[PDB]
Amino acid sequence: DNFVMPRQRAVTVERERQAGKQRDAYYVTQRVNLQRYFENGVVSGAYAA
């Protein structure tokens, strides 16, 4: 519960026609991030160096 999921916009599809090449470009973008309230709350182990 120390982590949150800030987000501005969801996943959106957007198709465009490029008559100069007759291709049909497709675009999908989204805006997200991972943030925590305080500088603590995670531990990770590791193999021996």
Partner: protein, 51 residues
């Protein structure tokens, strides 16, 4: 003077190779053409006599 208009000649397309299918060469070349004009005029014929 009477000025008449003359239409230009014909161009031709291009056979695009298979390699350039996805690039901007797919549409091929561009055919250009401009009009032209001609002119007409007249001369005078005359003769006289006396009695």
């Amino acid at each position: 003077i009477l000025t008449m208009l003359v239409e230009p000649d014909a161009g031709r397309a291009t056979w695009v190779a298979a390699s350039a299918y996805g690039s901007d060469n797919t549409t091929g070349s561009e055919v250009t053409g401009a009009l032209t004009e001609i002119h007409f005029s007249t001369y005078k014929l005359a003769a006289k006599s006396f009695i």
